[PDB]
Every structure is written in structure tokens, then in C-alpha cells.
Design a protein around this ligand. Structure first.
Ligand SMILES: [Cl-]
Ligand SMILES: [Mg+2]
Ligand code: NA
Length: 214
């Protein structure tokens, strides 16, 4: 069933008929529990970990670094002398990440590069001693997923068996990326369901009161 059906199905089984507060409470509970099920279940981090241990990459490319969570997560799993190359376009996110990576005890494995992926990626062979990449983690700006994927290919950085692992492909979403790698026979795809984590996004309501043409 769809997630809407499941929410309704939960309400029918568990809320008091005719009591709106009981319905709301029921739904808030259903969601509060799934979210606790996802956070305690450690889904997102368990997935990344699993992919890395499954494929044992030695040259690993990360597009995007917020607070350095993903860098630490991935670098701690690499064998000695493996390299994580991290590209982040925001100097302030880059600075926190380096601090995070230093503090986490994995700086020996990380090469952090500040700048735009589209400019750095073509420099990887020439300037960073990369032959081909064993794995790519995409967690940067969603409009860059497909362009950078194509660019990696054009630049000769992908080989057969190179693993692309793309985060946040539903929310905020990277549908043009998904359409391309899924429909293309050059890529073999698996989707892993998850939910967002606090570090990734924030939301809010706007209240806008109309004042008249006046
Ligand atoms: Cl991060
Ligand atoms: Mg993310
Ligand atoms: Na495909």
C-alpha cells in the first residue's frame, strides 16, 4: 500500500472514531515512531557503510561536505593508504569538515579540495594522481548530480564496477539523475529507502498576511 493508505489504516485500527484529537495523536504517533525506527535503526549510515565494506574502494570521491559527517563515516572504513578526495564548494563547510576530520583521527586519509566540482573533476587525473575512481559519493547540490556524472564519464574517471552512491535522490530529489542512470544500460541501479536526517536539511512555515494593493 501507499504511505497514505498506511496512515489511514493505522488511524482506523487505533484512533477513537469521531474524536479529532485522537486521530491527530494517532497519526503523529505513527510518524513519530517510524522516524524513531529510522534513527535508532541507523538506516542511512548503515547503508553507506555496507556499500563501502562490500566494494572496498581505494580511491573514493565525495562531492559535497557539510559538517564532515560523511567524510568521517567513510574514511574510517578505508584500508591504510586509501584516499578519500572530498570536493566542497563552500569554504566555511570545508573548514568545519577539516576540523571534524582532524578531530576524528582520520585526516591521514582525507584530501579536501575547496571549489566547484565542474572545475576540479577535470583536474583529478592531471593534478591529484587519480587513474579511475572506485567509488563516488554524491551529496552536494542536486542540479549537479547529472552534469557531474556525465562529466566524470567524459573525463575518463569511471571504470566498469565504479560505484556511484547518490544521497537525497527523492528529497530534495535528483529525478533527472535517476532517469538517466536507471534508463541507461551503462549503469546498474539499486534504490535504498531511507528518511532525512537533521544534519541534512531544515524546514519552516511562512506566514504572509495580505495588506491590499493599497
Ligand atoms: Cl557531511
Ligand atoms: Mg544528504
Ligand atoms: Na540502468
Amino acid at each position: 500500500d501507499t504511505k497514505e493508505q498506511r496512515i489511514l489504516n493505522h488511524v482506523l485500527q487505533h484512533a477513537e472514531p469521531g474524536n479529532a484529537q485522537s486521530v491527530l495523536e494517532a497519526i503523529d504517533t505513527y510518524c513519530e515512531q517510524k522516524e524513531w525506527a529510522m534513527n535508532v535503526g541507523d538506516k542511512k549510515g548503515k547503508i553507506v557503510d555496507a556499500v563501502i565494506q562490500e566494494h572496498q574502494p581505494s580511491v573514493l570521491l565525495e562531492l559535497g561536505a557539510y559538517c564532515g559527517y560523511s567524510a568521517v563515516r567513510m574514511a574510517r572504513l578505508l584500508s591504510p593508504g586509501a584516499r578519500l578526495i572530498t570536493i566542497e564548494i563552500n569554504p566555511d563547510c570545508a573548514a568545519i569538515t577539516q576540523r571534524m576530520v582532524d578531530f576524528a583521527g582520520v585526516k591521514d586519509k582525507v584530501t579536501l579540495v575547496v571549489g566547484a566540482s565542474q572545475d576540479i573533476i577535470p583536474q583529478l587525473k592531471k593534478k591529484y594522481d587519480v587513474d579511475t575512481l572506485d567509488m563516488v559519493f554524491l551529496d552536494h547540490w542536486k542540479d549537479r548530480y547529472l552534469p557531474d556524472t556525465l562529466l566524470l564519464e567524459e573525463c575518463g574517471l569511471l571504470r566498469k564496477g565504479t560505484v556511484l552512491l547518490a544521497d537525497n535522490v527523492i528529497c530534495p530529489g535528483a529525478p533527472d539523475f535517476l532517469a538517466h542512470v536507471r534508463g541507461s544500460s551503462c549503469f546498474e541501479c539499486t534504490h535504498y529507502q531511507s528518511f532525512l536526517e537533521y544534519r541534512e536539511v531544515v524546514d519552516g512555515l511562512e506566514k504572509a498576511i495580505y495588506k491590499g494593493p493599497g
